[PDB]
C-alpha cells in the first residue's frame, strides 16, 4: 500500500514558472484523492470529464502532475477552451481535458516586500501553443516588419516577462500555485482505494 507522492508536488518548496511548467510522472502507486479534496486550503478545485469521488474507485494508465505559478485572475485560463496570455503562450489545456485543476493562494510564500520578480511568463509568441506544449525558448520576438537580428529594441522584445508579486497587491494579483492533474488512460498503474 504505497501511496502516490502527492506531498512532493503540492508542498514542493520551490515552484517553476508557468512558461516552463514542471511535470512529474506519477505511476505505480495508489492515489488517495480524498485527502486532497478534503483540504479546504485550495481556492479552486474544478474537475473535467471525471467525478472526484469516482476517481477514488477508478484506475488509469498514467497520471501527470503539472505545477506552476500564475496570478489570481489568470487561474480561470487553466481550463479547457480558454484564451489569454497564459492559455495561449504558456500552458494550454486540451478541449477534451480529463482531469482536475487545483489552485491555492500563496501570497505568504512567493511574494516578498519590494517585489519578487523570479517567476516569469511568456509574453510574445507568433502562434498559440499546442495542448500540453512547453516553450522555454529565449528567442527575441519580431513584432513589426523590421528584422530582429538578435538585439532588443523597438519591435524587438524579450519574449519572457517577469511577475510583480508584492504583499500589498490586490486579491486578484497575488501568486497562486496551480497543480493540473492529467489522467492518461494498457495496464493501469494508478488506482484508487476502491478498485
Amino acid at each position: 500500500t504505497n501511496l502516490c507522492p502527492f506531498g512532493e508536488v503540492f508542498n514542493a518548496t520551490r515552484f517553476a514558472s508557468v512558461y516552463a511548467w514542471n511535470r512529474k510522472r506519477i505511476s505505480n502507486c495508489v492515489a488517495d484523492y480524498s485527502v486532497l479534496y478534503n483540504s479546504a486550503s485550495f481556492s479552486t478545485f474544478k474537475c473535467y470529464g471525471v467525478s472526484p469521488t469516482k476517481l477514488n474507485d477508478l484506475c488509469f494508465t498514467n497520471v501527470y502532475a503539472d505545477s506552476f505559478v500564475i496570478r489570481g485572475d489568470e487561474v480561470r485560463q487553466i481550463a479547457p477552451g480558454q484564451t489569454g496570455k497564459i492559455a495561449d503562450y504558456n500552458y494550454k489545456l486540451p478541449d477534451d481535458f480529463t482531469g482536475c485543476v487545483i489552485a491555492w493562494n500563496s501570497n505568504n510564500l512567493d511574494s516578498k516586500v519590494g517585489g519578487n520578480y523570479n517567476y516569469l511568463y511568456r509574453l510574445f509568441r507568433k502562434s498559440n501553443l499546442k495542448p500540453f506544449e512547453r516553450d522555454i525558448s529565449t528567442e527575441i520576438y519580431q513584432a513589426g516588419s523590421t528584422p530582429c537580428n538578435g538585439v532588443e529594441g523597438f519591435n524587438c522584445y524579450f519574449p519572457l516577462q517577469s511577475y510583480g508579486f508584492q504583499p500589498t497587491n490586490g486579491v486578484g494579483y497575488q501568486p497562486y500555485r496551480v497543480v493540473v492533474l492529467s489522467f492518461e488512460l494498457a495496464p493501469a498503474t494508478v488506482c484508487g482505494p476502491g478498485s
Partner: antibody, heavy 119, light 107 residues
Framework: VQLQQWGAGLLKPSETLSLTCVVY????????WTWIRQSPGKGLEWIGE???????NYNPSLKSRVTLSVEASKNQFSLKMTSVTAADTAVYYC??????????????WGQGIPVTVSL | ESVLTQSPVSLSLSPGERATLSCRAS??????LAWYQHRPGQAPRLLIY???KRATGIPARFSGSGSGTDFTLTISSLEPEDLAVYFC????????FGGGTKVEIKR
C-alpha cells in the same frame, strides 16, 4: 486601471524636466510603459518606452537628452530631460503599452500635464 | 518612415447618421493599424486595434476595416457623446500617428 501623474509645470530654458507617473490597480508586468507628448498643433511624438526589467527604447532625435527610469517597488516610472528648450513645451502623457495579438498598442492613456518652458 | 493621411479633416454629421473616416498610408502596413478617440476634455482611448478588432468596452458602433494602405473607421450611429477627434497609428516599423479628423455634431 488608472494612471496618476506628477511633475513640475514651469521650468527655465536651461533646467531639467522631471515627470513621474504611477499605476494603480495593475502590476507593471505585461506592459511596455511609454511617454508620448504633443506640442500645440505639432502632432504626437513618441519619446520612449521602458519595461519592468529596465529595458529602454528611445526616439533617435531626443535619445541624448532623455534618461528614463522605473521603480517597480512603488509601481512608478519617471522621465527626465536635460537642457529643455522652449520647443519642449508640450502636454506630456504617460501611456501603457498593452500586448494585444503580439502588437504593442496604447490602451491606458493618461490625462497629461503641460510643461511651460520660459524664463 | 511611412506617413498617415486622414480624409476628411472635419466631418459635420447629425446624430443617427453614419460617419466613415479614412486613414491612408504612404507605405504598406498590413493590419498594423489602430484608431484612437480623443474626447474634448478627457484623455484619449483605444477604439480599434489591429485594423479590425474592437477594443474592450468600446460600443459596437465603432468598426474598423481595410488592410494594406487604405483603412476605414465607420461609426454606425453618431451619438451626442461621440463628438471627438479621431487619429490613427501604425506599428509596422516605427510609430507614426495620423493627422486627425474632427467629428462635429449638427443640431
Amino acid at each position: 486601471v488608472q494612471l496618476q501623474q506628477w511633475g513640475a509645470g514651469l521650468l527655465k530654458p536651461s533646467e531639467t524636466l522631471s515627470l513621474t507617473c504611477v499605476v494603480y490597480g495593475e502590476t507593471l508586468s505585461g506592459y511596455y510603459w511609454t511617454w508620448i507628448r504633443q506640442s500645440p498643433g505639432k502632432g504626437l511624438e513618441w519619446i520612449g518606452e521602458i519595461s519592468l526589467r529596465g529595458t529602454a527604447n528611445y526616439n533617435p532625435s531626443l535619445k541624448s537628452r532623455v534618461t528614463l527610469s522605473v521603480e517597480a517597488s512603488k509601481n512608478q516610472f519617471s522621465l527626465k530631460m536635460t537642457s529643455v528648450t522652449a520647443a519642449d513645451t508640450a502636454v506630456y502623457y504617460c501611456v501603457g503599452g498593452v500586448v494585444l495579438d503580439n502588437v504593442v498598442w496604447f490602451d491606458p492613456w493618461g490625462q497629461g500635464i503641460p510643461v511651460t518652458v520660459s524664463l | 518612415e511611412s506617413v498617415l493621411t486622414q480624409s476628411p479633416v472635419s466631418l459635420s454629421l447629425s446624430p443617427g447618421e453614419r460617419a466613415t473616416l479614412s486613414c491612408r498610408a504612404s507605405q504598406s502596413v498590413g493590419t498594423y493599424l489602430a484608431w484612437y478617440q480623443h474626447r474634448p476634455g478627457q484623455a484619449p482611448r483605444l477604439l480599434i486595434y489591429n485594423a479590425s478588432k474592437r477594443a474592450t468596452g468600446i460600443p459596437a458602433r465603432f468598426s474598423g476595416s481595410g488592410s494594406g494602405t487604405d483603412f476605414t473607421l465607420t461609426i454606425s450611429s453618431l451619438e451626442p457623446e461621440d463628438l471627438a477627434v479621431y487619429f490613427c497609428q501604425q506599428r509596422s516599423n516605427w510609430l507614426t500617428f495620423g493627422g486627425g479628423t474632427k467629428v462635429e455634431i449638427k443640431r
